[PDB]
């Protein structure tokens, strides 16, 4: 919910710096990812409604124990709000931030063998919307810069024409590029249209609307932080600053 609310590149990377990896990993068993299932949608149909479960749903799924599953759990958390079930990763890796895993070699995780095409296909890039594809491409660029695979990232964009048009423009080592970026990455937000307490047909759409309706409740909740009215009560370390720089950028 909090990760889906971020609407700018600066906010997204700032959230990932303060968020540990354990938030990406889920400890609920879930179900196997790719299955043709029948779900109940009584608002629309009397018969059961066919659908296919996927990894970018908002509900936890079972994940492979390899490094591929860990990266695929991080991206699903960013684009869908929930991760997958990969237990016994370890204290050392789980305490690191999401940005450290994606960008830093000191974590101890080796990810240079990853194939962006296979990861995108397993995440069902075809079913993703524009904001979801932009968020995943941000994760790919950070991984490419960590492994020195910038050339491979560009070629993968050349093969996929729709991905090249929406590819965010920022150098993963320079903070000046992040501040200038004006891409809108928000998935949930205050809706200008009429939003009703009604169900959706597919699993992805229904789960997304739950976060959208939950965010509205979160926005008016006491947990939400109102910068306009309570800026002085925020701690100085985590207070918003114009000259905000990620470490090493």
């Amino acid at each position: 919910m909090d990760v889906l609310s971020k609407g700018s590149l600066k906010e997204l990377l700032a959230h990932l710096e303060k968020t540990p990896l354990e938030e990406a990993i889920s400890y609920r068993i879930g179900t196997v990812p790719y299955q043709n299932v029948l779900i109940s949608r009584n608002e629309y149909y009397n018969q059961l409604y066919p659908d296919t479960t996927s990894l970018i749903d908002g509900v936890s799924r079972e994940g492979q124990r390899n490094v591929n599953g860990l990266i695929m759990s991080i991206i699903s958390y960013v684009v869908s709000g929930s991760g997958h079930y990969i237990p016994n990763i370890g204290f050392m890796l789980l305490r690191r931030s999401i940005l450290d895993i994606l960008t830093k070699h000191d974590t101890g995780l080796v990810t240079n063998n990853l194939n962006y095409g296979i990861i995108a296909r397993n995440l069902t890039v075809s079913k993703m919307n524009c904001e979801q594809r932009k968020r995943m491409l941000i994760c790919f660029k950070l991984l490419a810069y960590k492994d020195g695979n910038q050339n491979d990232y560009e070629i993968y964009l050349n093969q996929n024409i729709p991905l090249k048009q929406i590819a965010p423009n920022f150098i993963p080592g320079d903070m000046r590029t992040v501040i200038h970026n004006q891409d809108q990455l928000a998935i949930v937000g205050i809706p200008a249209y009429r939003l009703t307490q009604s169900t959706e047909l597919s699993i992805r759409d229904d789960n997304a609307k739950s976060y959208k309706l939950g965010y509205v409740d979160w926005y008016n909740s006491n947990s939400f932080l109102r910068e306009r009215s309570e800026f002085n009560l925020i701690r100085l370390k985590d207070r918003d600053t114009k000259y905000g720089k990620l470490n090493g950028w």
Partner: protein, 50 residues
């Protein structure tokens, strides 16, 4: 009470007195927890501790 989105805030002196603590403990007791923000909640606890 009528509108849940509205919040109640409070500003205390640098050196809190018995009035500040009495006013802080009256708000936590007799106002909805949904009205009091988390940042305001910490501020009231800090005033009591000081």
């Amino acid at each position: 009470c009528m509108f849940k989105q509205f919040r109640i805030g409070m500003t205390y002196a640098l050196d809190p007195n018995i009035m500040d603590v009495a006013a802080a403990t009256c708000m936590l007791l007799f106002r909805p927890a949904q009205s009091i923000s988390d940042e305001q909640y910490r501020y009231c606890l800090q005033t009591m501790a000081v």
